[PDB]
């Protein structure tokens, strides 16, 4: 029965309301993997690209299961829900018309791999800890340059692209970096005020390459924290899953004297404050500039579930 539904939800990839969380359970815990394996056929890559299926399938194993399941939040699934998020995007009209395969093909594999071997906690809890990732990238989007660096070892490990020519190989690795490393949400405000300069200038050319690449920067931006864009049955799955992840890393520094991170203790904070205060500062800024990159139907849907949710959230206060 589960392997016919599985095929059957497939074929509503494109939907905004796609439900990640039935589709891993349909799979047992096989959504990441199964999820792209079909946008790679849909888009057309294994025939562009040539891509042996088998290695294929081997890498996004690989990736999928260098996610830590045991995390409550950065897990596979996760990263399966943002590769289906960036799906959606690549097809809105000045993507859809200006974007070519192997621009499709990165994007992809960038939104599979940006959380990869993520370890539940943050980085200023890596930092204060002297792990060894803190020391290895200087202090500096260390998960972020952790999660590439774990997925370019896949890429090569994998041998997907062995019959691309190696300066292809070395610029997917790049390209593929720039892209995870927009995810570092603390620099949010540069990747946000160069992209609303843009859109105030008119000037971006979504044939020039570097503006293209901004923008996908930014879309992936958005597929990584759209889940209060969700409905709100989506969206309370993931804040509860975000929430106790935090207040988890919140237990671990007050046990140890560690110094407790913001948002991270579940004495003084609340999962509706924590999603409120995240809407208005971080989401609602990014989605409200996406909307005027990309004013179509799905960009006001997401703003619409962004404000239904928080009048949930509120709702649920006193
Ligand atoms: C979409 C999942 N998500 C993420 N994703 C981040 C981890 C990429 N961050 C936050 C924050 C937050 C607030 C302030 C500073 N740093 C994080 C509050 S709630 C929340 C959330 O639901
Ligand atoms: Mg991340
Ligand atoms: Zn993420």
Redesign the pocket.
């Known amino acids: 029965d589960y392997n016919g539904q599985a095929k059957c939800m497939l074929e509503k990839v494109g939907n905004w309301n796609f439900d990640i969380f039935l589709f891993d359970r349909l799979t047992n815990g096989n959504s990441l993997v199964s999820l792209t394996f079909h946008l790679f056929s849909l888009h057309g890559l294994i025939e562009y690209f040539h891509l042996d299926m088998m290695k294929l399938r081997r890498f996004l194993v690989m990736i999928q299961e260098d996610y830590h399941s045991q995390n409550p939040?950065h897990n596979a699934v996760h990263a399966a829900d943002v590769t289906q998020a960036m799906h959606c995007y690549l097809k809105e009209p000045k993507l859809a018309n200006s974007v070519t395969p192997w621009d499709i093909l990165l994007s992809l594999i960038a939104a599979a791999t940006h959380d990869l071997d993520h370890p539940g906690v943050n980085q200023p809890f890596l930092i204060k800890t002297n792990h060894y990732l803190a020391t290895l990238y200087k202090n500096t989007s260390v998960l972020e340059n952790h999660h590439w660096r774990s997925a370019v070892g896949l890429l090569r490990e994998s041998g997907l692209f062995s019959h691309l020519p190696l300066e292809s190989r070395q610029q997917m690795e790049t390209q593929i970096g720039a892209l995870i490393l927009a995810?570092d949400?603390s620099r949010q405000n540069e990747y946000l005020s160069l992209f609303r300069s843009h859109l105030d200038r008119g000037d971006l050319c979504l044939e020039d390459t570097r503006h293209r690449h901004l923008v996908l920067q930014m879309a992936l931006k958005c597929a990584?924290?759209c889940?209060?864009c969700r409905t709100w049955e989506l969206s309370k799955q993931?804040?509860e899953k975000?929430t106790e992840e935090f207040f988890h890393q919140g237990d671990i520094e007050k046990k140890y004297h560690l110094g407790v991170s913001?948002?991270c203790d579940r004495h003084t904070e609340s999962i509706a404050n924590?999603?409120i205060?995240?809407m208005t500062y971080?989401v609602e800024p990014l989605f409200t500039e996406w909307a005027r990159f990309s004013n179509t139907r799905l960009s006001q849907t997401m703003l619409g579930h962004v404000g239904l949710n928080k009048a949930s959230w509120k709702g649920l206060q006193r």
């Open positions: 939040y995810t949400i990584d924290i889940n209060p993931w804040s975000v913001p948002l924590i999603q205060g995240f971080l």
